Structures are given as C-alpha cells and as structure tokens.
Amino acid sequence: GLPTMNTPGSTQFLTSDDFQSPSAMPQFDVTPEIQIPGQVRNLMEIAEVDSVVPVNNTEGHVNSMEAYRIPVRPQTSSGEQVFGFQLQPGHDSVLKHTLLGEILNYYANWSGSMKLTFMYCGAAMATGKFLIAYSPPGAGVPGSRRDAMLGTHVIWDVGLQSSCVLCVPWISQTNYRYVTSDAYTDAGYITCWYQTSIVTPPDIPTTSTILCFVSACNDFSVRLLRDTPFITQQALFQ
Amino acid sequence: GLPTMNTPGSTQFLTSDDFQSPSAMPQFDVTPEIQIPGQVRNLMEIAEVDSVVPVNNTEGHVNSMEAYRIPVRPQTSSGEQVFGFQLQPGHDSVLKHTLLGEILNYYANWSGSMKLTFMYCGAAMATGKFLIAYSPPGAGVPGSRRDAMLGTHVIWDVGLQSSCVLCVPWISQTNYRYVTSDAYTDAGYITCWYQTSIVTPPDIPTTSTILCFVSACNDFSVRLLRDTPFITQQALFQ
Amino acid sequence: RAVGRVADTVASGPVNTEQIPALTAVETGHTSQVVPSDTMQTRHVINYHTRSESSIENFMGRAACVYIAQYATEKVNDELDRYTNWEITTRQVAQLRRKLEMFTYMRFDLEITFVITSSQRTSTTYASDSPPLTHQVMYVPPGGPIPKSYEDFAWQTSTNPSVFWTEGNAPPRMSIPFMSVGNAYCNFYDGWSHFSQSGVYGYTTLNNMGHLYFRHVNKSTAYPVNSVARVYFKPKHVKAWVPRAPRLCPYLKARNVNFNVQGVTESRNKITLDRS
Amino acid sequence: RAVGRVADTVASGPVNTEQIPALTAVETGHTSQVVPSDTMQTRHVINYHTRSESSIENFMGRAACVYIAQYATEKVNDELDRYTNWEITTRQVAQLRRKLEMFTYMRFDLEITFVITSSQRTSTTYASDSPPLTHQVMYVPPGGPIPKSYEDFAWQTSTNPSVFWTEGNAPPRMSIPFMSVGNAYCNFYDGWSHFSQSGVYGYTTLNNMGHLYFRHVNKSTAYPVNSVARVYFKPKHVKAWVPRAPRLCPYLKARNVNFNVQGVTESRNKITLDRS
Amino acid sequence: DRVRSITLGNSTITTQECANVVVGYGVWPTYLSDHEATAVDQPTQPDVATCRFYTLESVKWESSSAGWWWKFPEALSDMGLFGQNMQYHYLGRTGYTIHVQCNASKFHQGCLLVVCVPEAEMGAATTDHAFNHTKLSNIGQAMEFSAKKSTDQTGPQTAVHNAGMGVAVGNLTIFPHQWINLRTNNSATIVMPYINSVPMDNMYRHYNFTLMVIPFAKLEHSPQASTYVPITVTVAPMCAEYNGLRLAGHQ
Amino acid sequence: DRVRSITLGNSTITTQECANVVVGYGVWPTYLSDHEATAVDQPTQPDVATCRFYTLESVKWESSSAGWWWKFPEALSDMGLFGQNMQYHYLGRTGYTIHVQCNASKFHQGCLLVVCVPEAEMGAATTDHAFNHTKLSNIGQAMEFSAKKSTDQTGPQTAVHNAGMGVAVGNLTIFPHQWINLRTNNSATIVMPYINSVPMDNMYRHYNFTLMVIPFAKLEHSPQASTYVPITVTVAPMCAEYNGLRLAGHQ
Amino acid sequence: GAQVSTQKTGAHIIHYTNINYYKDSASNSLNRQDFTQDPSKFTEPVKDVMIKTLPAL
Amino acid sequence: GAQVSTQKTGAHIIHYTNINYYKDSASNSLNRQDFTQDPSKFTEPVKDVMIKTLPAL
Ligand SMILES: CCCCCCCCCCCCC/C=C/[C@H](O)[C@H](N)CO
Ligand SMILES: CCCCCCCCCCCCC/C=C/[C@H](O)[C@H](N)CO
C-alpha cells in the first residue's frame, strides 16, 4: 500500500480532540429546525446580564431573601461604611454564585471591565447620597471615606432615577487575572460609604434597602476551560 | 513513509459502516441483468398498498377468516357503535400485522397521514349510512355518536360505489410519532357508528360484512431502523 | 423538490361538488390516491421529510450475523474437530431471512466480515504461554476438492480464495460480487429439481454457493482452545423485485418454508371502545 | 474588526454635561450598556482579546463520561451478569448535567467513545493463558427486541447498529445525528405524560433514546474477568436556546430535579471591610 | 365503464359488469428481446393455436368454502396445443390473461379475493416430511384450502388464513389482484406478464405463479334463492414461445 | 415616557407610571408559518374573543410575603372562550401580554421581581415522592412560595430563595423580567412569545411558562398608612390558534 | 478521479470526497444517496386510468 | 473538495486543509471557529430604545 509511519500519539483518546468518525445511523433524516426565540451562541451573552448580588450574606441570612438586602438608615454622623467586598468575581463569596460568577468558574482566566449597578428600594419621599469606590490593590483596604475618595469612585444622588452604575475598570498589569484568587493577580476592593445621609419626612420606616447587580462589560473575555468546583457527586445518580 | 496518526475508532467493526474492501473474486464477470417486472426501490412503495385489517380479532376469531369480517345488521335504534381501535399503526393489535404495520416495526419513528378504506360486502339490495370518525387524543375515547361528530369524520352512503375512504390526517405536535407506543406521542382513536341503519327488502340475510383496508398516504415517512419484535429464534435453523 | 422528499399538502377550503374523491371501488385492484386535502379543510404545510431510511440499500445495508462456526485446536469429535465447514446460506438466522424474504428476486454484492474469538477449554490446568493464534477461512466453489481432514493438501489454496488472520487485529473483510448463474438471486422457487416433479421441493435447488472452511493454522497448543467465528453478511448495490408478504409464522427449518399454523394477529376482548 | 473580538475603549476626557449615563433604571428590565469611557477618563486601548473559548461549540465540545457499565465473563448475580444495559441519558453524572442544564432546548450531534477495561476477579488462583477479549456494544432503538440473556438471538444485530472491539487497540467511536422527534432536545419539561395531569412529571417523558447493551462475545474464560465500559458523550454542531439559571443545589436523583434547600452563597462574618 | 370484450385467437370473452383490468406490475406481456436471450436456436411462436382462451372446470362456492388454488403453467398441461408444446420443448415463456367469473344475484352476498402470487412456495402440513407433487397441483384440478389446519402426511398446509405460505392472508394485496364483490362485480380479469429470474424456463419442474381465489366475506343468501353458484376460471396464454425441441417429455 | 395604553379586543389597560415594555427575547408573537407547521388540518383563530385581557384575583402583599407563582396556560383554563378552546382542541399555540399591577404610595417601600420562566420544572418538597398536580397549580389560584423550606408530602419545594428549581433566586434575571419598585414604578408589562421545542402543543399536560412575583425588598410602611396593598395580574393571549378539534376534554 | 458529492444534511463544508481504490466495482461502498421511487406498479396497476374525482364505476 | 481555512493564531503556514470523508454531515468535526454573537436578546430586550445618555424615565 501507501508506505506510512505512525507518529507518537497514535491510538489515544484525548478528550478535547477534533476528528471525524463514522455514523451509526447512515442517511438519518434529521427533523427540521424552527425559529425558537432566545438562541445562545456565546456564554458572554449570558454573563452580560445583570444579576443581583448577595452582599448581605452574613449567616444566618443566606437561607432567606435577607442576603440580597443591603440595609441603610438615617445616620447620626456621616461618612460611615455601607458595605465592602473584595473584587474576586469567581472566588469571593459575594460574587461567585452570581450569574457572572458561575460562568467564570468554568474558566481559569478572566479579563475586562465590570458593571456594579445599585438600586435604592426605599420610599419615594426619602433622599440620599452615596459614594461607591473601587480601589486598586496596592495600598490595602480603604479605611475611611477619605481613603476611598482617592481611587475610582462615583457619587450617586438618589432621585427619580433609582439606579446608578459604578463601572469597575480593568486596571491590571497582566492581560488576564485568575478566577481562583492569588496574590499576583489581585484586583482590589469595592466599598460604599455615606456621602451625606438618608433624610426622610415623618411617618416613614427607618431602614431602607439597596440592591446590588453585577454584569460584564463589552470588553469582557474568559479563557482556559476547566471543571467547576461547585458540583460534586460520590456515586452515579440512580 | 507518510507520517500518520490513528484516531479513536481504529480496528473496530461498526455494523452500519460504509467502507471499501478488496474482492475475493477479481475480474469476475457478473451475468447481465434483465427487465424483471415489479422492481422495488423503496419500502414506502410497499406500505402505500391497501391491506385488509383484522378488526374482528377477538379470539377465537384470529384462527379463521372471521378476523377480517366486521359484522353489521339492521338495528332497533340508531347511533350504536360498529367497531373501534386505537390509532397505533405499529403497536395496536389490529394494525401491527398488516402490511403497513409490518414495515413500521422495522423502524422506530413514523410520520404522515393514513387511509382507512371500507368495503361493504353485503347484498346489492341492502342500503345503509355510516359515520367513521377520527379523534385527536386529548379528551379520551368518544362515548357516543354525538361525541364522535366533533372530530374528523366522514359520513359514508352505501350505494353503487361500494367503498369509502376515511383519511386520517397527521395532527401532531411533533414531526414524528413512535412506533412502539407511549403517552407523549399518542395518536388518537378510530371509531365507526351507525349513521342510520341497514334497511333490506325481504328474503335477505340479516348480518352483512364490512372489510377495512389500511395504507399510507404520499406524505408518509419512516425513520430510525431497528430489529423487529416479531421474529425470534432460540437456536440456528438446521 | 428534491428526489426522495415527501409531498406538501395544499390549502383546501369548503366544497359542495359533484366530485366524489372519498367514494371508490376496492374491487378494481386500485389503491385510492386520496390526500387529506380532498376530504377536509387543510392548511399549506411545507413538508421537508425524506424517505432516506426506507431505501432498499439503506434497509438492507447493515451487517447481520449469518452463522456461528465452531472448531478447536484439539478434536473432541467431528463437531468439535480441528476444522469445520459451512454451506453458504442466508436461512439459518431469522433476522436476515425475514428481511430478504420480503422480495422474490434480488441482486446484490456482498461484504463478508468475520468476528473470530477464542476461549480456553475447561481443564484441570490453564497455566501456559502460547503464541498468537492464526486462522484460515478458505472458500471452496461448488465442485472443488474439500478438506477431508487437518494437514490436508486442499488447504494449499493455490486457486481457491483464502484469508489469514492473527488474533488481536481488525476483523477480516472481503467483497463478493453477484454470483448467481441466473439474472437474480431467487429467494423463492416454487418447483422441483427433477423434471418428473420429484426430488427436492423449494429454494434449495437454486442455492449452489459453495462451502466455507475454517481452521487454526497453528499446529498445536499446550492446552486445547475452542474458537468461534461469526459470519456477517452486508448486501450492497441491491436491486429487488416482486415484493412478498411478510412472514407471520416463525421458521422451523433452514431448507424449507414449513411452518406451524398461527392466528393472523394477537387478540382483544371486544371489537369496540367503551369510555368517554 | 474580526468576529468574536472584544471592543476597544476610546479616549475620553473631562465632562460637564446634562447627559447622565451612570443614572438608569433597573425596573425597565434593561441592562445598562455603560463603558468605562462614560464614567471616567480613559486612554485608547487596542484590545485584541477574543471570545473563542466561550462559544457554545467550544464550551460543550469536550468529551465527558456519562456512564460506567459493568459486566463479567461469569455471572455472580444479575448486576454482575454476563451482559448489562443502560438506558441512554445525560443525567446520571453531574458535570455534564450541569453544563447542559444551562439551556432549555438544545440540538446537537453526538460522538460516543467507549473506554473499556477489564480486570481479573479475586480468586484463589490466576495463572492462566487467555486469548484477547472482544466486546459488543449493541444499540437498541426504542421498542426493539432486547437481549433477555446471554446466547440470545437478539445479538445477531441484523438491523440494530453494533460495534465490536478487541482489547489492546484504539477506543471505539461513532457519530450520532440529532435524534429527537421534536425540533430540539428538551433539557426541561414542565408537565406530565398523561392528559389528566398525572403519571410522570418532568423531563423523563421526553427521553426515549433507547438502550445500550454490553457483553463479552468470547464464550468463556479460565478464571472470571470483570469488565468496565465508560461512555463518553461529546456534543458537536450545537445550537442552544433560552439560557437557564445555573443550579445551586446538588442533584439527588436522575429522573427528577429534586433538591435539598441550601443557602444562596457561602457566608462571612460582617458586611464591611475593616483595615487601612 | 362496466363492459369489456377480450378477443384472443378464435375465442371471445364478454362481460357486462367489469370492474377494470389489472395489468401485472404495469407490464404487458411480450416476446423475449435479442439482448436478453440465452438460448441460440430459433424459437417457435404459435400465435393463435396457443394464445387463446382455455376454460377450466367450475368449483361450487358454498358458505363453508375456504378457497381454491391453481398452479401454472401446470394447470394447462393438457389444454390443446399449449399442452403439446410443453411436452416437446425444454424451455418456454409466456404471460397470461386470467379471467375469473362468478355471477349470483342482487339477493346474494359475498366477496372473493383473486390473487396471482409469483413463486407461491408452500409449506408442508406434516413437517419434517416432503410432500407429493400431486397434492400441490393436479393437471387441471382446483386444489382447495381448508378452514382449519391440515394433518396430511404428504400434503401442503391448507389453512387458508396462513395462505399456505406462513404469511397473513390479509397481506396478499401486494400481488396483482382484484376482488369479486357480488354486490357490484361480476368477473375479475388479471393480465400477468412473465415473471422469473431467468428469461426462459422449464414448464414442468417449476410453477411460475399460483392463482388463489379466497372468500373473504362468505357466501350467504336466503334458502329460497339459487343454492348453487359456480366459479369458472378462463385463462389465455399471451406471447407464448418455446425452445429446445426434442422428444415428448416430461421426465 | 411613563404613560402607555394597551388595547386588545374589547379591553384596554391604561398606566400612568410605566417603566417600559419588555418584549420576550426580542420577538413579537405571531401565527405559525407554513414552513414550520406539522399538523395538516386548518387551524382556528378567534382573534378578539380569545386575544383579550383576562384579570385574575388579587393577592394581599404583606411584610412576611415570600412570593407567588402562576403556571400558564393552565392559569386561564376557565377564562372565557380561551378556556373553551382548550377543551375542544388537541393542540394550541399562543404568546402572552402579562401585566402585573400594584400601587401603594410615596410613603411605602418595596420591590417585586416579575419573571417569566419557560419550563419552570419544580422539585418536590418531600423527596423520593411524586407530587399532585393541584399543588403545582390550581386553575387560577396563586400558588405561593414560603420563607422557609416545605415539608409537604405531595407538594413542591416552595422555599423562595431556591425558587423551587434548585437555583439561586438572584439569577432569575436572564428570563424576561421587570421590577416593580414602589418608589418609581406602578406596573410591569412583559410580552412573551411562544417558546417551545415543538410548533404546537397540548395545553393541559404542559405548563409552557411560569410567572413568578417575588418581593426582593419587603413591604414596609408606617402603621397609619394603608395596611392593604393588592397585586393584580392581567394576562392577554396573543395570536392564539388551535388544532385538532374533537370532544371536550381533558383526560 | 475524485468524485465530490453532496453530504446528507438537514433542512431549515457540506461535501465529501471519494476515491475508488480497487479495480472491481463490487469493491465499492454502498449507494446510500439514491432515493428514486415510483409506486404506481403496485398501488394503481390498472389498464384504464382512474381519476380521483370521477366515479370509479 | 478540499476546504483550506485559516488557522487559529495569535496577534501582535497559517492555513489548514480539510477533506470530508463520510457521506453524513453528522460525521463531520466540530465547528470550532464560529464566534458570532448578539447579546441584545437578553441585555436590552425592551420595546422602546433606551439611549445611554438620556434619562431612562
Ligand atoms: C477465506 C475467504 C472467504 C471468501 C468468501 C467467499 C464466499 C462468498 C461466495 C458466495 C456468495 C453467496 C452470496 C449468497 C446469496 C444468497 O444465497 C441469496 N440471497 C439467495 O440466493
Ligand atoms: C454498539 C453501537 C452503539 C451506537 C450508539 C447509539 C446510541 C445513541 C443514540 C441515541 C442518542 C441520544 C442522544 C442524547 C441526547 C440527550 O438525551 C438530550 N440532551 C436530552 O434530551
């Protein structure tokens, strides 16, 4: 026949191969596809949708809807902290079971900017200002509102538009950060502070609620598929 | 030689393969083919031929020609039922040994409309009207001629043309039903009722005979070849 | 519209006509060509279904086991001899026989594939070390010298087609052309072999395809080894004529169409349906 | 710019405008399209990153083990019988099940690969000499005759697709087309099998894919040998619709979506950060 | 229409209630072509002395009649010069015009399937036993089915619902067929071409096709009507030719 | 703007504080095309007697309310001629205009997620046990979630933070949704197309989508304000068509 | 001598190449893609044509 | 019937050849190089268009 020679790698099963193989059902007439709405061609279409973040996840609050409810109230003095978490969108406990966080745990590398949206769910007669800040990871955590005003931040005025977007920019020295966290690719901190206060008229409840949403920007990308460390089994499901 | 590499699936016998293989008789002179009449290029040419249905198959009647003879007679009141069976052309006992039913048991999926032809084999002096109805499978079996007049039906006037065709349409939510029956792909019911009566002159026998024929329409198709559950053997035939 | 694609149904409205497509005559031998558009109101459906799986080449072109041949490296009797044979036929297994007997005359090329497997015979000891076994499947055309034993001269296969195969590799496979002395293979023959209407009745007189002899070409083993060779026929380039009725009754023999009398279908208790 | 490449960010300077890109309304169901160029001063970055790994074909196109089938050359009971079977499903393993259940309806072709391995059963002796084992993996479509035992006629596989494989070679592999009677595979079915809203609730009524029967085609061994066959599904030519929320809770059964109630995420001690 | 006239040789068939003509597999009988022949000697073609109508004996149709079969060309072994040409020749080849006729009344009822089955190879009644050829078919006698099974030690299995072939009798409507429904139909005519896997054949050791006549709806009438209805079969060869002239056979 | 008027049939919805309209997956409902149909019979399309607004019963929103769900088309099984056409037909196909409405005040506070989940297949509260269909959804009754887990022996798992599906409730914002924030929003309207893997389906054995209404920020107000706020759901079918006329079902 | 033909695909990179290796046509693969048919030999084998709308007798 | 396509390379001898061997399109390899997407079915599925700079209400 044609003189051939076998290279290393013959008669192996590499599970991420791409080879042709013969059909067990030859000339099988496949049914025609129709227009079903909501077709997905990329997992980055899923990750660019808002998903509400459980910032209030101090247990026991994770076993109820109290995990999503960031509480605010009128203050006695200004500049106190509302919440704060590390910006680890695949490793931090606040962000790793969100809809953006669950896609990133299938991957080992992530890159791009993110959008933190906030939503004031108090009464329409209550006003307020807030400062939401992002800190690059070099100096440590901000300790006050003076420490937080030096980084990327936005002052949000609660009014007729109930929502504000803090855009977390990609400020990194590498083109990719790791999903499981390490010290080389640390991304920094997100904190929120009282810019002024909550000022209400009489006959209004004290504590209000803020909802935090996460999504990816249009320069977001993922890399290096892996298994997720979220689902486990000790035996086959019968 | 030419550097090669072996993919998974080398040195296997997949019985539905399609590969070339060398000849044991090289340059064998095959005898010339001639025109033999009745050439078959498709099993759907066989399934589109009428084949008389054993509707009267209540044993002991299957061991005689009484299985094909649907009996009718003059009635005391009208609107009674003549016969009825489920429309399972590969699983129902009435239709699975007919000529259309035997081809479908080689396959797992079927699709298309069917033709039920009826043939009045009584005397030429006897008249009669009949209602033959098809019911989609949602509500259950029709309980009367009032229940059967709401679905797809035809009123047959017995006259000089002895035959009528009830066309069973393909009213399904899937493009294919299963040959072995299940509840997801149920196809419905076929029933027949006295529209009026059998009216005869004197000196004529009471009981007459109706023959039912099944065939496939020109939009009929089958899919997913399998072994038929009709022939068995415990040893090799010696 | 492509070849092999089923027909669309056309949109039909209400009718009040002197035309009668529903009324016909079965007595004419004619199967009525009634469409659902003729007896009820339909919509326009573009049917994309195809009759691919129902072709004679696709219905027949799957390999089916036709014989299980047994032979050993040590003779017990002449059924477990050193060698064995098989008269080539398609009637010993029931799955392929029922598929071929849906037609009266066929004309096809063949693919024969062997799945040969060995097993160590039951003994008081098995601890040995044997070289890999090699088998021979010699075809003998009708009228040739057959092996009368092991160590025979007829296994020299100077003009008979042979194949050799060591255990461990891919299964052996060769192609066979259309081999009948007529113009088609006869699945059925309603007649006799002698002109006086005597001798052998049936299709057995039209099946002279020869024998297929099996052996181990290894001379000996330390402990005896039983082999089994399965023969797989896949028909290709298939033509077929005069479609038969499918068989109701199971088979009894390989050289006959003899049967036991059975009912036409399975039963039920009454002829109606009785719910709401 | 090529298809699949992410967007560049544009250079933005200071603003004092009546435009408010930061302020929006979540109540509209709308995800805001805010770029970092809108809320801060940026530079011009030419981003060359690509969304290659995140495609539905690349996310799904890796082979995952879906079943572990066990069978022996000598029966212990009907769980370690001569033969075994498996109803074809994707829900017994958890890694592939969580990936498929991110979508409601899918439509793909398959690659099935078997990693069959044998092992000698624990005995008082092992010193034997056996020929190489050959296995059969016969697919039975829904409603066909199943093997009721070893030595069965149904293993003649005249119309069922079979594969044969001797130990030592490359793993066997075949391709499967899209097999649903609908227009997509349903990962979820919110309904029942009977019209009276009773019977079986869930996706089990929409999964009629048939069985997969395994055996040793060798007749016997000197000492019994246990085999294990791993089934690997790789979906190719994948379409997907209606993206689902990922599952929080682990699975309990294969025919249900039943779960135990768990918290939405893992906890921490307080809602702030407290260093400098 | 219902009228039809078939003229072959010096014989004519007239019918006033004809259903139609079924022509084989859509093929009219004809002589063998030059690019399909095997034998080299010149054939003989007696055009009108052989391709004429030959009527057989009638069979009495009763209520308890299961059916009858005729095997061809052995059914016409003694019918004139068609039978004399079979004896003197090794090979022969012909198509047929089968005409089955049965009239009763407008006060009778019944239905007969009339099939022409090519290679209707029949099983044995008592198995593990070969049967005699005179039980399969005599020279012109109608061999008849039975309502129950046969225990003949040297005969075919004549249970009619299995049709002697181990198949369902309802599935015989793929072979070229008509129906004689007494309500509407008087006769039934089938034109068969030559069906074989060889271009010519021996007309003694081979039954090329079998004509079956089977009551699906049985004959019933008033006792004061005519209690005797016969079923006559009239068969005409078509384009019959022969080869291999030697002495008179047929052993 | 905040004003919107939706007119379908003989019914009109007016809203003075509208957020927007969410349209499905970007698809407007329409009738089935000829190149996608499977059934061959002519469909029936009652354009205004079925594609009109049908309002359900209000549910009382409290501080300790976990949420409610409705399963469709079984939620409108008795709503006029939409319910009469489900009983008489085997197949049906429709898209919807869901309109949820809840006003409180400028002195109340709360927020409701309004999701439309296609194939919201629910698990069982007590596992290794199949549940009853009347616990999944009654005919128009609002089936309601719970704050803690359910130990019902024949019911779904109604813990709201798992949403009955074993997922995180925060991730439901990929399904077509709006929010009713009482600070700014009065109502919420979602237009759903037909989502299925088959072109038509049976409207009894299959819940095509489930409408969930979940308080993310709970209702709280002064005790001297109105302590009763209801939540009304008004649903209009869109481009509804049917096939397979037979007797009235639905077993 | 390469025959490029159309692959079996569905309905709503689609071609394959074949080289013949052997000198006998019986050595070739199966003719899978031949779907021609004409069922009028069996379903309507009558001498005079029978139009559907007209009466059969 | 050879389809020469572009290989997956980085950014700052780049082609591969493919022959189809089988007669079924389900026998083909994976479509790795198809990166088309449109996320507006999910992120912005509202009826009236919402410009970023303008107020949402
Ligand atoms: C060791 C080399 C083995 C070579 C094998 C050659 C054997 C094949 C030659 C004869 C082929 C006969 C094909 C059989 C056809 C059936 O009998 C017909 N369907 C019935 O007439
Ligand atoms: C011995 C030869 C073995 C041949 C193997 C054939 C088995 C494959 C045929 C059925 C393929 C079913 C594919 C399954 C799809 C999933 O169930 C869907 N994601 C859920 O509906």
Please explain how this structure is put together:
- This is part of a larger assembly, with two copies of chain A (238 residues), two copies of chain C (276 residues), two copies of chain E (251 residues) and two copies of chain G (57 residues).
- Chain A has helices at residues 44-47, 99-104, 145-148, and strands at residues 4-6, 51-53, 70-72, 81-86, 107-111, 114-120, 127-135, 152-158, 163-168, 177-178, 189-199, 208-216, 221-225.
- Chain A is mainly beta.
- Chain A has one domain (1-238).
- In chain A, strands 2, 3, 6, 9 and 12 form a five-stranded antiparallel sheet that branches. A four-stranded antiparallel sheet of chain A has the order 4-11-7-8, with no helix packed on it.
- The relative contact order of chain A is 0.25.
- In chain C, 6% of the residues lie in helices and 27% in strands.
- Chain C has three helices and ten strands.
- Chain E has one domain: Jelly Rolls, CATH 2.60.120.
- Chain E is built from two helices and 13 strands; from the N terminus they run ββββββαββαβββββ.
- Chain E has helices at 81-87, 133-136, and strands at 4-8, 11-15, 21-23, 54-55, 59-61, 68-72, 89-101, 109-118, 143-144, 177-181, 187-192, 209-220, 229-245.
- The interface between A and D is large, with 109 and 102 residues.
- Chains G, H: This is Genome polyprotein.
- Chains G, H: It is found in: Host cell; Virion.
- Chains G, H: Belongs to the picornaviruses polyprotein family.
A few lines on this structure:
This is part of a larger assembly, with 2 copies of chain A (238 residues), 2 copies of chain C (276 residues), 2 copies of chain E (251 residues) and 2 copies of chain G (57 residues). Chain C has helices at residues 36-39, 56-60, 94-100; strands at residues 23-24, 64-72, 83-87, 103-120, 134-140, 164-166, 173-176, 185-186, 211-216, 225-243.
Radius of gyration of chain G: 21 Å
For the biggest sheet of chain C, the summary is: 5 strands, antiparallel
Q: Tell me what portion of residues of chain C adopts beta-strand conformation.
A: 25-35%
- The beta-strand count of chain C equals 10
Main location (chains G, H): host cell
Family (chains G, H): Belongs to the picornaviruses polyprotein family.
GO molecular function, one term (chains G, H): structural molecule activity
GO biological process, one term (chains G, H): symbiont-mediated suppression of host gene expression
